[model samples]
Target chain A: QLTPTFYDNSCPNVSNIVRDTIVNELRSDPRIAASILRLHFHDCFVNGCDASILLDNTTSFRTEKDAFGNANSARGFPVIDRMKAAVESACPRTVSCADLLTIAAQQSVTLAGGPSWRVPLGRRDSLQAFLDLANANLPAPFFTLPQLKDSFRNVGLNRSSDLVALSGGHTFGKNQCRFIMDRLYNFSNTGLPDPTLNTTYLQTLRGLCPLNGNLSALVDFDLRTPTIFDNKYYVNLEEQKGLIQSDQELFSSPNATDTIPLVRSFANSTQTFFNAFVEAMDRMGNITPLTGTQGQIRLNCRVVNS
Target chain B: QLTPTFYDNSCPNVSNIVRDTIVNELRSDPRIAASILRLHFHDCFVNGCDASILLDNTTSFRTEKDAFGNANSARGFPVIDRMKAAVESACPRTVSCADLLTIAAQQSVTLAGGPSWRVPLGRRDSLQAFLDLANANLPAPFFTLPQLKDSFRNVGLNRSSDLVALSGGHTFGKNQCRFIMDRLYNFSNTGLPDPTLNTTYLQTLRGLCPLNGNLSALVDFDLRTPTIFDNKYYVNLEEQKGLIQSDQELFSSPNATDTIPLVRSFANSTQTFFNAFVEAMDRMGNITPLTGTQGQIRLNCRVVNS
Candidate 1:
């Protein structure tokens, strides 16, 4: 739905700059790849990838950075900042920060050793950050399969396969225990652990997630292949080992028909996960986008031009 | 139920000595508390706490130590050995190592600040360890609520709520990720994560449990009060935060109607869980016991008398 050539005439070297800067920064810390992927998810899911999330919570600009969802979990801003600086040197306000996030997310997956997708450009940045919307729209880790699907659907993504595949983002990055700990310990106040969790895997989670355990400590989305970007997230799901409860609910939901098979196919082949991820990323990227000169180019991602 | 005075004639200071020894060892390392609780579980579940699990895999003796269920997860041998050595010096084979384990487990709880239970004495050590029965009897980390009940039921434990109440022993111990990685990454081949997990706690579990992370990494059973033997295990279960899937399934099982109240009662008051645990511990101590003169009082717990 978007055009890759959105920047060719205005900034022929924009893509090159983003690629180079992200790659170089990523070399310093591979985990920046996971943070970059999250920034895009945060940016796109809220009023589309308008780069509004990049806005700082300053006296002049109230931002989504403090939203309950992205408050602590979202990161990788400085790297994206570095990317913007490199691009602006050659393009002179020609490319929008919104387009760069979509590309950066895809490149993050690639740099982390996952498959790549063709991300389209031409989106514009938002003058305002949606702090309340981010808090409300972003899915909680406790969401079941239906609730998770609803969250995406609320943002105009309806495909069941999209829910399962987009969740394959578990292939990279890490998850906090705050969301899934309930499943590990209590489920809906049922006075029992979730029955769906594998008995063996539950113990491992408890080890890392002791009550009052360090909150900032990181747990991986992919245990079988933590640093590699691959389909093991789907493979782990096949065995009922998905990290987040919402992520597992996609394939385990009693009523859902489409996601189970999609999960199975992706588990069997990395190529399958890549195709769905690429396709889902595209759908998510196009969500309520700002295009066609709808918003101004900010000289700095943190603030609009004076 | 066996009498606390059962050891009165044979050794009066026996219980006192065991308690002192465990508490002393505990100050050196509190995790020994978890080991003692687990040792009691393995011993009682198989053949009535005859100290079968402590037997060695010698040419003539097959031990429960290597049973797939106990392998690698069960630990803390030197502490029990020290307890036995002290007991023999004071009582000269008057106290069985099996008796020491019963008191030691209770003291481990006490040292960890959990409630106390009165363990019966006069149980003997087995000349024959149930290598096969231990393998068949102990619950795996992956069992569902029904499956967990079956494991206990098969061994003559039939209180429906017994599964939920006894499971509160997890209040102090730790678990390995090898048996529980599935719960954190993908659960039930659903191509998704566990749905019942608390979103906030999921990240904590991942911090200690990454894919292919340290094989020796340990996750605690009760996060709210990890070192204490309290009702918090039931509380975490109420919150669906019980670390093991098998442990949490008691109240969550859709098909089972007996465990919810028990889960609630225990979660509400530590005294309630403590009373039930006391009764259950007595019942567990009676599982196919080898009474007076039926088995030898092995001087060394690790090896049967020659």
Candidate 2:
């Protein structure tokens, strides 16, 4: 029940480079964003945003996995390890790992095209980690929008803007086409033509994934501009060029038509997009955040190192 | 950050008698759904969905406001006030106002043909309230989709499904037709059309609206049946029958074609919709939730009455 103004006071500015670095580093690594965002979503879905998602068997620390399915030493370990290392070199324990995670996650979501969230600072790390927590809370890549919404709504969000903004992360990274070919070829019984790719682009894509072949193509949804933070994602949608079925779904749903134009406008302006992006980021961050006895902050992002 | 599984514990099911009573009462006064749902969405958007949105400034408890914006000590107060009272009597503190808000919002969203969310249990009540939180966190009705997504992604979510699912809340609610008449009569922006409706629907909508008219048509996106929980919303989009420009924009956007069919399918199956809804609910709940010392639990839903 803390006032939103309380967050304004407690949370640091997004423009602070020291703070931004931690967030930037975490977001720059696709694997880290995917892992942590997935973990955050997973945790909130099963519970309230109580951080119960981070707890392990003994309830001492948080843990997660890598893309290779190997047991990672921590749940969000790599990101935190880097953050702690950076802070120790510059600010030391001045910034908490918990706060870093919260802030960094918010930044990452915004960079991708989600809401601006207000995060309360001063979270301390825990000494516990749970493997079960990661498995239990993280969502599968193939989740339908309905399933995805249920997860988001449980945490306190119920808006398409929040949903699509968060999903805009796809604009920045690369995806294994195998993960989203269904949308490129056939999806949801819709008859939209395969993305109207350039002849060369289509040929190359087909080569990587032959006709009727289970092939994985590495495609960047952001296309010509992958590094810049803009609303090109919505423009891409307007052009029938979005990469993932999940990414494209936001524009196609009957529930989202009102938002399509906004997305287009966002794609057209970086300043406006950033402003809205930051606001949306704050909203996503405010979901039933952990507090009091509800959950503990994990010392490690993986297994209990302590 | 907290993990997801911690809050995964499910709430006890309400007895059929209580459920029946609640439904019967709502049926007797269908307007209650609109009112409660409006409050639910407004609260979640304005604040972090902590039930703080309803609390008055001076008091930590919820207030009763009449349609005319006057503080009503009677009438409107007893409507939902009594409903909550009955539920509280049936299950002491088992359901918090926070949970109730989540439930009410989710139910309203689904009834409008969106996904069904899985709400986690054991959310404690807060006696704190803050008006600034509502002002800062909630998305203004004027917000576009990109801005909404940025807000959502800032928290931790990065999926399109989450965006569309959450926005589906618009399906059950009412808005000033002026907000959307352009999409209906002028541009077909959101695919809303009132071919047979009297001039009142259009004239009233037009009279209150300027060129933009605030696009405030208070029409239900789920026009076929606003109260039912199903996927007709998706079917409607397929047939270009969506009522709001925002709703239609989702399907018409090139980026969204991939998801249109999935949305349609969700509209077709309650189980599928429910499953996906639960997952999305889980995702939304995890957006930068409090952990360690980032924030505190308030004694009340307003004013940080810790």
Candidate 3:
């Protein structure tokens, strides 16, 4: 989407402003690398990188922010808000927070030791949010591989092979224990412990996620290389050591899989995954984006232009 | 198999004699631990655990000894013959070569630091060998998960789930470079290096398996615990350190894999694998065998009793 100069006349420095904000946020909280990516995932996946997910509750539309999938699970909004403020100060009504998050998502990858590249520019914010669509399309931690595939495929992304490349985005984040509690206890009605879990890692997970309450307790998605982006995620899949069910499903045993070749590709080289992820994010960023007189530039990313 | 006392009257110490010989063989050559189990795998997987694999080439029938699957890959016959000699010396027509191999397979596991088990006894040798059956049933190092499963299933083993339990035999053996070369040089002809292999491991393998032939070059199946057997094989599968294709299939990525729970069980605790493997060997050893004078006990394991 090298429209090459989509933002040249409107906002010459918009992408840079977004990148700086993400870098600053990453330095302050490396978790933002994970959080920023999370926002972009929900944004693009739901209804085009429309920033439909970024919209707050408006008179005409209910916010998706309070949706269960987004409530405690999704984050990075505060940082996005800060970036939006900085962009507004520089040039009001020029940049959309949708593009800011997408650009920041790419920046997020680099700040955490992943490859970086330019995303398609000039994506416009959605006039209204898709609370139901966000809930339906957002891949959950507990999703099975097919569920993830179906979820991603709904939005035009290929889950046949390229999904694992994107699922590697999990390398930089943390997950709530509740989302994966079944794997910890009573995983199957057969009462057999989740056989897919590593016994040694299981002991540690049990401690991290208590039996009764702490549904919100946090654990690193990529424990071996926590805080660093790497192919360790695919290696974790090989070990049956990945955190969420969705993560492990990409490479479990006893079934035919189309994605392992690619997973193996990433596990062979993290650099390979970083580059593919950048390329994929680049493609997904342009999915149904509002452009060329189709939508108005918002004065405030939180509200439609007056 | 129900005749637990079959050897008591004729050769009270039949199993002990076989075990003692294997202990001596292991003491003489550590590799016999790997060779011994491989013999058992090839023997039982095809036409039951009847020592069909132990037969050498004869004028009346060509043997499985030179079958591509066994040629040099499956071995330990020399040791099995030696044990048969000792067992025969104790009581001329009592213990069968079939029984000797089964017991020795269990001994091999323990000698290699894997769990020891009590395989079914009272089994007799097959009157005829099955080179064709052996070629068809034994899982290949290059098999994908489904292919490996079907191969195992053709013999009534639950390839979908319990196969990993049996595939765990790789815990102590080494695979020939020829068997896994495709995954190295031009895996999938994707013109891409195999991603499931560790970068450091790939170099070691590439050197071990030279591009200019010597396909029989050997490399330990589990590099971490090359000599001593443990759950390291499962752990290797986890780290993408598995040396062969079928070896890594149990944990291949991107789907509802049936064997993951079992792989996770083994990777989490080597001891868990030990007990499961022991139980499985017991079951496979009793698949279908010559019994009740249906077949004669061969005095020399490598030749039929003339």
Candidate 4:
């Protein structure tokens, strides 16, 4: 009875419900919102937002730690587990864990001051846990814009607008100094830190993030809308104030320069950001989905149960 | 002088050399060739031989566990340390650990019963580690031929010959029954378990690898030449006796059907296999080389010291 197409085009309504719950939670609970936003930033800044980057080393599949050596519950799992638990209680096996994880990623972006977007649901869970694939598909924190674009392109996203808009999720969260030191100290032509950063804050950042050290302080990429889901990231880029090299490349690269004005326009209109983001999300959601005996629905996400 | 690019290309090579030392040590020291081959099988069968797949989850550094919960010291730090020590004794800061790891992976395919092709040397080390990028570049074990092709293409490999030949590494290895059960138990009407398996072996496999239970058994894919590195894999595929679905698909798919005769010819001739393999290795060796302030050559592969 298990067809290869079991997951294709089957979970959008569930995804919408999950998405609504996440947005509602963000609106109602500041702590959850902050935590989810932080997860989003960490995912993107360290490796371009592949959630598998959060896995831990132990065989027990208990919990994973963060870069600062702090042990934390898997960031997205709690959100997902709670959502699945609620759905199961109400609908009983109507939705899948795979669909839940996909929606969680989309919702994480929205919570991080980015646009609310539509993501197709019904991706089946893979029977295998692919640590190698996860390591290869995600982007590095130090990736150049071209590298980022290629990574996006490999996932079937070829437009600069999709890359730029997806990156807007960085606007409202904190970034580790290890990822941003080059932007602050080794920036092209010796540009100073963003003018919006407090002078004392800059000093503290510089002190904690020495020129040749691991540099692990935290800084928000967008000071104007630190907690609001919006498009101020575009405005920041327009001012040549984007925080990472990859971000600034949108304006500097000939291939992406055309997207600058579009980003600027979005920064001026939240509705525009929302519309474009949803369209991009729709495309991203379908990037080579699992189909036709191609993959399996995993019983557990952490490890394969064979 | 440590450019960003230095951190990019060097890390994988460093890991590669380290992993190679472990496999070689296991092959020579203990009567552990079977176990070592199993590790290689699991590594590739779970995720296409990306050493990055072995990274410790919390630390985002390589670990000593294969994807299948097997001891992977056959693929970890001690091996890297020894390789570094050897390189330091002979070359003294001339060679980087990253380059060593890349060399090790190339050597690993040969050790695991594939072709021993010459690898281009002299890659630098990377001080940087990004969990996300690592996840994105490696292919998942469950990927089909189309997915596999896409992954190889992303890294600049396009030949069907290379895919068939590289996949021959499966010839001398064994896999957990769980890894290939989907192919054996759930393959659609057109696909079925290889009929060449002995009746006793099939019954034993069926007993150990139940259709619905937590199926776990270790079976040799290259039953005829499990220890000798040769071209039996191509022969097996031509006979419709491949162990995994991905392996069988190469011979069965329309796009790859033309490769069957070529694979059969190579299976009949070891010299041809070696020659073609060397050519493929030469091609794989050149994938996306580092240049123009992209990566660094590290004195040590594990940590970046000033």
- DockQ per candidate: 0.07, 0.05, 0.01, 0.02
Candidates sorted by lDDT, best first: 1, 3, 4, 2
Q: Could you tell which candidate, 1 or 2, scores higher by TM-score? A: 1
lDDT pick, better of 1 and 2 = 1
Query: How close is every model to the real structure, measured as TM-score?
Result: 0.51, 0.44, 0.50, 0.43
Q: lDDT score of model 1?
A: 0.80
Residue-level lDDT of model 1, residues A1-306, one tens digit each, is 478777778887766677777777754565788888888988888888899999887666578999988877788888888888878888888778888878888888887667765678888888888898898899988776778888989998998877887888878677777867778788789978888787778887777777678767778788776766788888888788888777777767796577888888988987777887888888888898888879877777888766
Task: Pick out the ten consecutive residues of candidate 3 chain A with the lowest summed lDDT.
Answer: A186-195
Give a tens-digit lDDT track for model 4, residues A84-122: 666665555445455555557667666565556445554
Winner on lDDT between 1 and 3 is 1
Which prediction has more favorable DockQ, 2 or 4?
A: 2
iRMSD in angstroms, per model: 5.3, 6.5, 19.9, 22.1
Looking only at chain A, give the TM-score of model 3 against the true structure. 0.93
- Candidate 4 - chain A - TM: 0.69
The whole-model lDDT of each prediction reads 0.80, 0.50, 0.75, 0.55
Instruction: Give lDDT tens digits, candidate 3, residues B70-141.
Output: 765566767777777777777987788888887787887877777765566788887778875664466656
What's the CA error at residue A274 for candidate 1, in Å? 56
Candidate 4 error regions (>4 Å): A1-306, B1-24, B27-77, B105-118, B188-204, B211-217, B291-300
Query: What's the C-alpha lDDT at position B225 in model 2?
Result: 63
Top TM-score prediction, candidate number = 1
